[PDB]
């Protein structure tokens, strides 16, 4: 009895829905530490500290393959870049805040795209 929700849900609507969110959160001025995965060593102990180092390119990687059959994949992973940025990095560095920040802009993008739901 409802039809006002914009939640994509489908793997295709999401794929490219998210393809836009991602594209945005990634195009975000706070997305450069996540725009692409670090050198694995750019970040000292990165893979050690970061049990799951995800990025916007890695995000988009999945995206590309339409992997995001759920905004949660998309949420978790993009959230995996912010959180990993929030995990390892210090809220003093450029990236950490850029994580919270992005995570915020991104939040407006997912929200907008009927994403966020978890």
């Amino acid at each position: 009895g409802s039809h006002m929700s914009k939640e994509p849900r489908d793997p295709d609507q999401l794929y490219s829905t998210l393809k836009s969110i991602l594209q945005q959160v990634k195009s975000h001025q706070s997305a450069w530490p996540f725009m692409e995965p670090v050198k694995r060593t750019e970040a000292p102990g990165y893979y050690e500290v970061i049990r799951f180092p995800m990025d916007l390119k890695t995000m988009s990687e999945r995206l590309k393959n339409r992997y995001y059959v759920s905004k949660k994949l998309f949420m978790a992973d993009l959230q995996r870049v912010f959180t990993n940025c929030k995990e390892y990095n210090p809220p003093e560095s450029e990236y950490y805040k850029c994580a919270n920040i992005l995570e915020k802009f991104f939040f407006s993008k997912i929200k907008e795209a009927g994403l966020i739901d978890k």
Binding site: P44, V49, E94
Partner: peptide, 13 residues
Amino acid sequence: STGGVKKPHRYKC
């Protein structure tokens, strides 16, 4: 305005 390094942090030495 594009950082190249990963501002080596210290969260889990």
